[PDB]
Structures are given as C-alpha cells and as structure tokens.
Design an enzyme around this catalytic site. Structure first.
Site, PDB file in Angstrom:
ATOM      1  N   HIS A 174     101.674 -38.312  53.430  1.00  0.00           N
ATOM      2  CA  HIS A 174     102.315 -39.548  53.877  1.00  0.00           C
ATOM      3  C   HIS A 174     102.662 -39.384  55.354  1.00  0.00           C
ATOM      4  O   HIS A 174     102.424 -38.333  55.947  1.00  0.00           O
ATOM      5  CB  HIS A 174     103.452 -40.050  52.954  1.00  0.00           C
ATOM      6  CG  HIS A 174     104.732 -39.261  52.990  1.00  0.00           C
ATOM      7  ND1 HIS A 174     104.921 -38.097  52.272  1.00  0.00           N
ATOM      8  CD2 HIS A 174     105.916 -39.521  53.592  1.00  0.00           C
ATOM      9  CE1 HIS A 174     106.151 -37.651  52.475  1.00  0.00           C
ATOM     10  NE2 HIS A 174     106.783 -38.507  53.251  1.00  0.00           N
ATOM     11  N   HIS A 225     105.474 -39.353  57.178  1.00  0.00           N
ATOM     12  CA  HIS A 225     106.680 -38.737  57.711  1.00  0.00           C
ATOM     13  C   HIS A 225     106.370 -37.388  58.369  1.00  0.00           C
ATOM     14  O   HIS A 225     105.343 -36.766  58.131  1.00  0.00           O
ATOM     15  CB  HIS A 225     107.728 -38.566  56.611  1.00  0.00           C
ATOM     16  CG  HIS A 225     108.331 -39.850  56.132  1.00  0.00           C
ATOM     17  ND1 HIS A 225     108.972 -39.961  54.914  1.00  0.00           N
ATOM     18  CD2 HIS A 225     108.429 -41.065  56.723  1.00  0.00           C
ATOM     19  CE1 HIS A 225     109.417 -41.194  54.769  1.00  0.00           C
ATOM     20  NE2 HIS A 225     109.121 -41.882  55.859  1.00  0.00           N
ATOM     21  N   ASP A 275     107.498 -34.391  58.074  1.00  0.00           N
ATOM     22  CA  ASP A 275     107.291 -33.211  57.238  1.00  0.00           C
ATOM     23  C   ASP A 275     105.860 -33.096  56.723  1.00  0.00           C
ATOM     24  O   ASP A 275     105.486 -32.047  56.177  1.00  0.00           O
ATOM     25  CB  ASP A 275     108.298 -33.126  56.076  1.00  0.00           C
ATOM     26  CG  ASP A 275     108.407 -34.388  55.259  1.00  0.00           C
ATOM     27  OD1 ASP A 275     108.294 -35.508  55.780  1.00  0.00           O
ATOM     28  OD2 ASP A 275     108.714 -34.269  54.038  1.00  0.00           O
ATOM     29  N   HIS A 334     108.138 -42.767  47.143  1.00  0.00           N
ATOM     30  CA  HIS A 334     108.919 -42.345  48.291  1.00  0.00           C
ATOM     31  C   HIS A 334     108.538 -43.132  49.543  1.00  0.00           C
ATOM     32  O   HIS A 334     109.382 -43.429  50.394  1.00  0.00           O
ATOM     33  CB  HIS A 334     108.681 -40.860  48.466  1.00  0.00           C
ATOM     34  CG  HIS A 334     109.147 -40.330  49.758  1.00  0.00           C
ATOM     35  ND1 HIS A 334     110.464 -40.056  50.031  1.00  0.00           N
ATOM     36  CD2 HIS A 334     108.450 -39.996  50.864  1.00  0.00           C
ATOM     37  CE1 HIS A 334     110.557 -39.559  51.255  1.00  0.00           C
ATOM     38  NE2 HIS A 334     109.347 -39.520  51.781  1.00  0.00           N
TER      39      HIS A 334
HETATM   40  F   LIG Z   1     106.250 -36.280  51.290  1.00  0.00           F
HETATM   41  F   LIG Z   2     109.428 -37.013  53.707  1.00  0.00           F
HETATM   42 ZN   LIG Z   3     108.805 -38.592  53.417  1.00  0.00          ZN
END
Ligand SMILES: [F-]
Ligand SMILES: [F-]
Ligand SMILES: [Zn+2]
Ligand SMILES: O=C(N[C@H](Cc1c[nH]c2ccccc12)C(=O)O)c1nc(Cl)c2ccccc2c1O
Ligand SMILES: [Zn+2]
Length: 231
Positions: free
Chosen positions: A84, A86, A88, A149
């Site tokens: 995804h 983000h 991280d 998420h």
């Molecule tokens: F994630």
């Molecule tokens: F994340």
């Molecule tokens: Zn995330």
C-alpha cells in the site's frame, strides 16, 4: 530465535526471521508521530534471486535491509512489491530502485503515493483493481481483498509454503486498536478479511504488517478489532 519485538530492534537496524524454506520476514522499527513501532515485510526466494515485499519503513532502514539480506542470504533482490502507499511500505523505494531493484505497485498505490508525497514504485501491477482479484508474481500470488486499512492494500500468499502475508489489512493478536484509520474503510474491512479467509483457508502462518505472526486467528481477530472500533 524468537520473533523480535519493538524494544529489541534499534531504529536503523533490520532483523530477518525465517518463516519457511525460502521465506523470511524482515523486521524494522521506526518513529512516527512520536511513538516507535515495529514493522514487517517479506522476502521470498525465487531460484537464485529474491522477491521483496515492502520496504523497511524509510531510506536508512531499507539500506540496512539490503545489507542484512546480503549478509544472511547472499542472493540479490531483483524485484520488490509495495502493498500500500504508506511510508512503511514505500519509504525506501528510491534506495531499492537505485540499487537496481525493479519496484512495483498497483496503479492505485502509485497514484496515492504520489499524492501523499511518498516515494513511488516504478512499475504498475495491473489485474488487481477489483476485490477478489489475484495475480501471479514470481513465487507469490498477489491478492486484492478490498478496502481495509487503505483502499489499495494488497495481501501476498506464498503457495509453496502456505504463508499468508497480510500486510496492514491484518492486525497482530496483541492489537487492541485499528491504529491509523485516516485512510481506512472500517465498514468494508471485515468483508475484506472474510474474502481473505475464504480465499486462503489452507494458510499455516499469517504475518501482520506490524507485530508477531500467528495462525489463522489473526484474520478473525482483525475483523473483531475493527468492528469494535467502529462500534
Ligand atoms: F500496510
Ligand atoms: F501503514
Ligand atoms: Zn498503512
Ligand atoms: O495504536 C496502535 N497500536 C496499539 C499498540 C500495539 C499492540 N500490539 C502492537 C503490535 C505492533 C504495533 C503496535 C501494537 C494497539 O493496537 O493496541 C497503533 N499501532 C500501529 Cl502499528 C500504528 C502505526 C502507525 C500509526 C499509528 C499506529 C497505532 O496507533
Ligand atoms: Zn495508536
């Protein structure tokens, strides 16, 4: 070994943990909004090369990840997928690209990363825009379960080892909170988890985006946490 926890990994260091023959998780730690969190990704052997799933949450951590792989495994990382948008998952993509790793993500992830000001994987992964979609990528299957998420989150299955890497769509058993829900779809997330449950009933290990791996209980636990949060 035991699975490393947040207080055992200084920010800037990366640990590897063998999950199965030819399958490792990578574990790093990072500071975000004034708290430190551990974070996982995946490494899967593909012949004499490696496929990487997710960065180690930042440029310096991802450089340390490449060094740890070279030391411990000694095979080159040739491709990486970010699950995804983000940081991280994509923070460190520039380090990977400059090292010669071909970096990939869905078109959705790439657009969202660009809008967020995050690093952008080079290549687009088509065939994943509808919930329930699955595509093969080297030694893994990539699956789009639906919004959870984030709207773009992917999960990864290693058929040869029955390993399910849930990324941030799956929470560790010790989680009590859905965490950062700014980009989440709490109404859809339980249904997306059910799609995972139905598609991978033979999974033997489930790895969350943050925290300890476990068994299939992590899937139901995730649905429970996110429903309790919404409630
Ligand atoms: F994630
Ligand atoms: F994340
Ligand atoms: Zn995330
Ligand atoms: O509140 C969270 N977690 C607490 C603590 C916890 C239990 N078990 C854990 C295992 C790993 C990390 C945090 C935990 C929980 O759910 O009780 C939380 N967690 C993560 Cl990851 C976040 C990541 C990015 C931004 C915010 C986050 C966040 O708020
Ligand atoms: Zn929190």
């Amino acid at each position: 070994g035991e699975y490393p926890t947040v207080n055992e990994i200084p920010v800037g260091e990366v640990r590897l943990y063998q999950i199965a023959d030819g399958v490792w998780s990578h574990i790093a730690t990072q500071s975000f909004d004034g708290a430190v969190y551990p974070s996982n990704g995946l490494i899967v052997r593909d012949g004499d090369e490696l496929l990487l799933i997710d960065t180690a949450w930042g440029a310096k951590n991802t450089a340390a990840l490449l060094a740890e792989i070279e030391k411990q495994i000694g095979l080159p990382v040739t491709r990486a997928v970010s699950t995804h948008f983000h940081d991280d998952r994509v923070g460190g993509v520039d380090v990977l690209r400059k090292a010669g790793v071909a970096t990939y993500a869905s078109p959705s992830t790439r657009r969202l990363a660009e809008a967020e000001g995050n690093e952008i994987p080079t290549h687009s992964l088509e065939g994943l825009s509808s919930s329930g979609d699955a595509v093969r990528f080297g030694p893994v299957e990539l699956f789009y379960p639906g919004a959870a998420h984030s709207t773009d989150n992917l999960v990864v299955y290693v058929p040869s080892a029955n390993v399910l890497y849930g990324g941030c769509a799956v929470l560790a058993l010790s989680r009590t909170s859905a965490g950062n829900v700014a980009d989440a779809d709490l109404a859809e997330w339980p249904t997306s988890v059910e799609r995972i449950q139905k598609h991978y009933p033979e999974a033997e290990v489930v790895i969350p985006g943050h925290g300890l791996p476990g068994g299939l209980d992590l899937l139901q636990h995730t649905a429970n946490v996110v429903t309790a949060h919404k409630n």
